[PDB]
């Protein structure tokens, strides 16, 4: 039967089809991964007959390429699957103990490759942290129910104190991408930035809701919990200027206006409440 399952697998073309599509999503063409290939891979993540770790292996493999174009596109494809694919994909990445290792990545083929290597390294760290965040709390901050009956707003004190700093780590990694509007000049980096922006808006909301919950609980916590809360407030306050810059860039490059306005509004409201306590 194990022998049967193996022989069956040696006659299956599923894995090979998946790998070929990963290659098509990550060609040397300087454009975002094509929608048709991303869609096919999304459907793959819905298929129980698809080997998810093998699909992930193919994406990691493409990140060993020397070309920034191939590497960046593999990161983008991975991100796209984490966001739009079956949740078992990000769940699987969260379960791995080795993720992307692109901290030394440097393509020297020309100025474009050189400039893009910096963003590849930052983006890779963000995707690693996105997986790690899921691993640490066992859910995706950008997917959970929001509002007063939502996850972040209803979380109990002890969990809340452990959870907000994880949101803060994922946020920091996202904010470290740090691209200027005049650097968004090719389809590859633009595709990555669109996904980052989508994550960011949802992440900012989760962060704000965590802060709101803390503010509501503040007068009812133990003393050591208050200390941790204060540490959370202080870190919230110090990232405001970096968050403001992020939203500014997103607007320069063009709900967009609205979703950003609500982030500015709730964040401003939170700042005011925090400063009023101090």
Numbering used by the authors: 5 to 258, 1015 to 1038
List sentences quoted exactly from the publication behind this structure.
Here, we show that the R-SNAREs VAMP8, VAMP3, and VAMP2, which cycle between the plasma membrane and endosomes, bind directly to the ubiquitously expressed, PtdIns4,5P2-binding, endocytic clathrin adaptor CALM/PICALM. X-ray crystallography shows that the N-terminal halves of their SNARE motifs bind the CALMANTH domain as helices in a manner that mimics SNARE complex formation. In this study, we provide structural, biochemical and in vivo data to show that the internalization of VAMP8, and consequently that of the highly related small R-SNAREs, VAMP3 and VAMP2, is mediated by specific, direct interactions between the N-terminal halves of their SNARE motifs and the ANTH (AP180 N-terminal Homology) domain of the endocytic clathrin adaptor CALM. Thus, CALM:R-SNARE interactions ensure that R-SNAREs, required for the fusion of endocytic clathrin-coated vesicles with endosomes and also for subsequent postendosomal trafficking, are sorted into endocytic vesicles.
In an attempt to obtain a structure of a complex between CALMANTH and VAMP8, a construct was designed in which residues 11–41 of VAMP8 were fused through an artificial linker of six residues to residues 1–264 of CALMANTH. The VAMP8 helix fitted into the spatially complementary groove of CALMANTH, lined by residues from helix 9 and helix 10, which was blocked by helix 11 in the unliganded CALMANTH structures and by dimerization in CALMANTH(1-264). No electron density was visible for 17 residues that connect the last ordered residue of CALM with the first of VAMP8. This would allow considerable flexibility in the positioning of the VAMP8 and indeed in the crystals where it bound to CALMANTH a VAMP8 SNARE motif could reach an adjacent ANTH domain to which it was not covalently linked. Key residues in the interaction, 13 on VAMP8 and 16 on CALM, are spread throughout the interface between the two proteins. The residues in the CALMANTH:VAMP8 interface are highly conserved from human to fish. The interface is mainly hydrophobic in nature, burying a total of 1500Å2 of accessible surface area, and a full list of interacting residues is given in Figure 5D. The residues Lys24 and Met27 of VAMP8 play key roles in the interaction, explaining their initial identification as residues of importance for VAMP endocytosis (Grote et al., 1995) (Lewis et al., 2000).
